[PDB]
Point group: D2
Chain length 256, copies 4
């Protein structure tokens, strides 16, 4: 609609500002370590976005990674650069994410990977799209004919590989949370699992996976929402096959 179209055009415009600096940001800043960085372009991109929303959606709230952490029954969740590390090194797997949550419910989601010219989006009840055409998660039902994905985490990643590497065609670690969730919605991957992520990393990828007929849940298999800590995105075919392996790894390291 108005909101969806606005979001698509906004992220597509800002995407170009990011291209100016892609792989060329000399000022890398650490937030809570060397694996968790931010740059001046993350902020500039966020300002560009936040300002347009604040302009057309005057009395609505914003929750943006870099700083703005408001609350509201009408909240826009923004990730100026999902995959800042990639962005800095020059890898194409980074994106801009914009979800519009109403009453804690994701009503719209859009992910835009600039260097790839891929714009995945979904509005509630309208289905998922990719640059205008319909997308639906894969039909794959056998883990052996599946390609799953994960993000670079503590001891989780390396272990989740060990467990999965056997019953799976191949595992991917691309670099963009939002983009990886959206890829399942587009049928490119079979499932995506995250750990200790904020809502700006998954709010958009959540409605896009479900509107594309997939499944989005926490590690307990109980349907997840924008405010869940663990995330499992899947085509809804080999979901449980994954729910298990994940907890198998979680227990081994420490959990419950």
């Amino acid at each position: 609609m108005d909101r969806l179209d606005f979001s698509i055009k906004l992220l597509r415009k800002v995407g170009h500002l990011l291209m100016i600096h892609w792989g060329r940001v000399d000022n890398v800043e650490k937030k809570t370590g060397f694996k968790d960085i931010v740059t001046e372009i993350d902020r500039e991109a966020q300002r560009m976005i936040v300002d347009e929303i604040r302009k057309f959606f005057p009395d609505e709230n914003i929750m943006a990674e870099e700083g703005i952490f408001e609350k509201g029954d009408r909240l826009w969740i923004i990730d100026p650069i999902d995959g800042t590390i990639n962005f800095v090194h020059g890898l194409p797997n980074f994106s801009i994410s914009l979800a519009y949550v109403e009453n804690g419910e994701v009503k719209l989601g859009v992910v835009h990977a600039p260097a790839l010219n891929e714009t995945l989006y979904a509005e509630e009840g309208s289905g998922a799209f990719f640059n205008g055409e319909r997308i639906r998660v894969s039909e794959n039902a056998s883990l052996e004919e599946c390609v799953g994905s994960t993000g670079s985490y503590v001891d989780f990643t390396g272990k989740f590989i060990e467990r999965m590497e056997k019953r799976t065609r191949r595992i991917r670690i691309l670099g963009s949370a939002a983009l990886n969730a959206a890829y399942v919605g587009a049928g490119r991957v079979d499932f995506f699992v995250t750990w200790r992520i904020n809502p700006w990393d998954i709010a958009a990828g959540l409605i896009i996976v479900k509107e594309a007929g997939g499944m989005v849940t926490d590690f307990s298999g109980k349907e997840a929402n924008a405010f869940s800590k663990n995330f499992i995105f899947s085509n809804g075919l080999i979901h449980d096959e994954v729910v298990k392996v994940v907890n198998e790894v979680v227990e081994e390291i420490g959990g419950k």
Copy 2:
């Protein structure tokens, strides 16, 4: 120039055929099981290349992943699709690799990712390029300022992540060996490790990294060649420690 230009235009032309089928080939074979496939496109793309190769290079040999394994002083190493699994699922990280090896010497290489519109190539003494512009290897001289990569291998993988997660910013698993290697030459990645690999998977990558001022060696740390089993590519500023870690990852599982 002659063979360089030839090679770029050719792979670029072939990339488009791949695009017609990319993500839409549900007729998969297994060259050795699920973890290793081939498609008619693999075959159909390789054909379109080999044909052209002879049309202008009669008295020369050819080596393609699936089908031709000739040998000679004027050889061409072809890989119709590097990342067939990706190509099959709809992932952008797949490429076409081609190297001209004269007297056992890689005289030039070219990697082309059609979905990403990336063409990385290099000629002996001419330096490396990326779509016409020069590319050098990264300057990040410390593991805490690096992003590494490797392919999905038996135990080496999940055990390489664990053994290097706290070492580097991130470890990526993209899918295409030729592309991944070309990326360290591009400085998008600081190092890439490949275990148990064929010549057509690194032939081009090899000369691209070295021409881009990087390092390519076996695990023994000795200068690597088109014919080696395990490779390591880097900016030559963090090779030592990587060799070290690589040489200490096979330990935990085995492989003498």
Copy 3:
């Protein structure tokens, strides 16, 4: 729509076939002269399009430029390559046109420019799009504030350009009818004028420009359909001024 989504996916896929021979076609045949040519690719592309339509819509008629001139209630109009001259020479302004005419009126229409990655489409009562985002006709209400365009015609073009130049910013001759009409819908040009044209050249553009909010009439101002001979696509704001000048041109050349 599954019909529109069907249309977008089919032309996008076929666009890669075209990309293989774009600028690399050696055998150009004259249909009625050196200014009206055709190639084998036009046919190959068309065949790819027709077989898919006939497979998923077995009882609907087809009217494709190169040969298939059926007629009916459920009709598919096709121009395998709008701008074969451009396509042959290597210019990017060439496209694949597809419209669905029902009981005389165009229900949907998509235009795909492969080299340009531009897919403009519209389904009746749903608005016009450009790669997933909504587009609308321009807002230039003054001719001196406009950019117009036409095709390449015998007498018409020259007189036109003369009788318009001193009254508009500039007139453009890009080379693809469908693409040009669709651009009026995208708002990139303010009006497009075609003379002694064919239905497959304007069916898709007709609905896109109408859905985009503009106007499409014949040279007399009378609204038009896929079957009129002459056309005028505009933003609706400058139309009269255009129809006037056009006839001043039909007047000098001749008519009756």
Copy 4:
């Protein structure tokens, strides 16, 4: 090489600045009427180009279209946006142009069309390229085998269209002098004529077409250089005829 690479990367970088505002330029200032305008984006982009050149070649001269007119042995000719009108309306045919003129003679030219992803360029003595690929002018030896092109001139155009349309397949009016000239070098067009012009309009085009094996002369047939106001670019196989028509058109209006 030092200068060429620097030029290619700078333009591609500035290219994205342009993409942010492409088709969304609010305030258009008039230079010499609605026929010739400039926008703050032209200035904003020019400043970004000038900025880098001052930094790496501080002791060199600059001649930029929008306000900088220096003179010297080492000189850089610049056009922030060639095809501003196109840029404004949202047409993809616009580009950045940069030439380095050492000792009165241009030895390097770069033309980048951001919206098209086309970087054509040429360093004196090394030949013409297009995104790394090598290019050479066309081989069409007869006008009926060609596709010519012109700029939008108040009297020239219409006449040229008239005395040239029955003689050739089609005459194109694209909207970007630098790109149009680079196109003859790319062989996408057989000839291009420009009436009334400045060094920043065709300095880069000049060298590219020459390194591509074609010819650039003033209307009189006499060779042409960065400093002339009549230009005719061609594949050098139909040049004579074009100069013919060009002159004839001049007689239909006025001159000497």
